Design a protein around this ligand. Structure first.
Ligand code: CEF
Length: 268
């Protein structure tokens, strides 16, 4: 049931000038679309979705975790921290930091939460606990975005991303209240309008998390999509390119998502 219908991913990545990795699963039938799906691609900021899931998982044990106030100094602010910079003088709750990391890709919020979780190894440990043996986070922001060709640090594969996203949003990896909170955060993301969402009709529900490393044409998006009247689709689209100064392309991500949905026979 893999790649029942051929789609021109190769032409698309050749036009882009790099490599595109796609996994998409129709959770009703089990049909999948897979292109470079087991290759490693830099996570960039897309690790933050899993980070928020790991926070939610911990909150199942720690009742009051999500409402815990977190105060931070100016030294915690790193570039691209649009929410946390507005609450520097007040602090934010763990839940607010999680929402900011997911929905605005706030970099300082993610670093604060990563520290709370025991760093990159703690997030990696959470991913191992749900059966993901591919994911690895190795560094903190912003160093984790270096996207060096051939470097496995701070990478995963499109397939592992999609499988883990499925477990967390639709499967049993989170308890039901935490699962719906994770879905709600992803649905509220503001940074993905030109990526997977651009391939998804407006009348379908979608949640996603983006990543943009800033170098090596490296950017990504993963999403759960609820077409009306059929089972949800889970998919991941990751890109990279050989030269440091190669630009990423949102349009290539949207185009690859379109091809994935077409390959699954989902009418858009
Ligand atoms: C996650 O990917 C974060 N990306 C960045 O901080 C960088 N963006 O470059 C445009 C970066 C870090 S080091 C370097 N040379 N560049 C945040 N995530 C989002 C997203 O989710 O796409 C952004 C678009 C920018 S900030």
């Amino acid at each position: 049931l893999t790649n029942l219908v051929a789609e021109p991913f190769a032409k698309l990545e050749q036009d882009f000038g790099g490599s595109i990795g796609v996994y998409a699963m129709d959770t009703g039938s089990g049909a999948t679309v897979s292109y470079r799906a087991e290759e490693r691609f830099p996570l960039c900021s897309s690790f933050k979705g899993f980070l928020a899931a790991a926070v939610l998982a911990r909150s199942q044990q720690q009742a009051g975790l999500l409402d815990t106030p977190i105060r931070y100094g100016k030294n915690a602010l790193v570039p691209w921290s649009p929410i946390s910079e507005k609450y520097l003088t007040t602090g934010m709750t763990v839940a607010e930091l999680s929402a900011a990391a997911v929905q605005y890709s706030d970099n300082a919020a993610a670093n604060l939460l990563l520290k709370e979780l025991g760093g990159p190894a703690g997030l990696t440990a959470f991913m191992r606990s749900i059966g993901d043996t591919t994911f690895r986070l190795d560094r903190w922001q912003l160093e984790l975005n270096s996207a060096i060709p051939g470097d496995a640090r701070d990478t995963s594969s499109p397939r592992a991303v999609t499988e883990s996203l499925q477990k967390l949003t639709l499967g049993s990896a989170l308890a039901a209240p935490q699962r719906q909170q994770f879905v709600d955060w992803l649905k509220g993301n503001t940074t993905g309008n030109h990526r997977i969402r651009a391939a998804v009709p407006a009348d379908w529900a979608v949640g996603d998390k983006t990543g943009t490393c800033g170098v090596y044409g490296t950017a990504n998006d993963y999403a759960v999509v609820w077409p009306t009247g059929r089972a949800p689709i889970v998919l991941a689209v990751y890109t990279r390119a050989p030269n440091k100064d190669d630009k990423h392309s949102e349009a290539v991500i949207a185009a690859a998502a379109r091809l994935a949905l077409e390959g699954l026979g989902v009418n858009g």
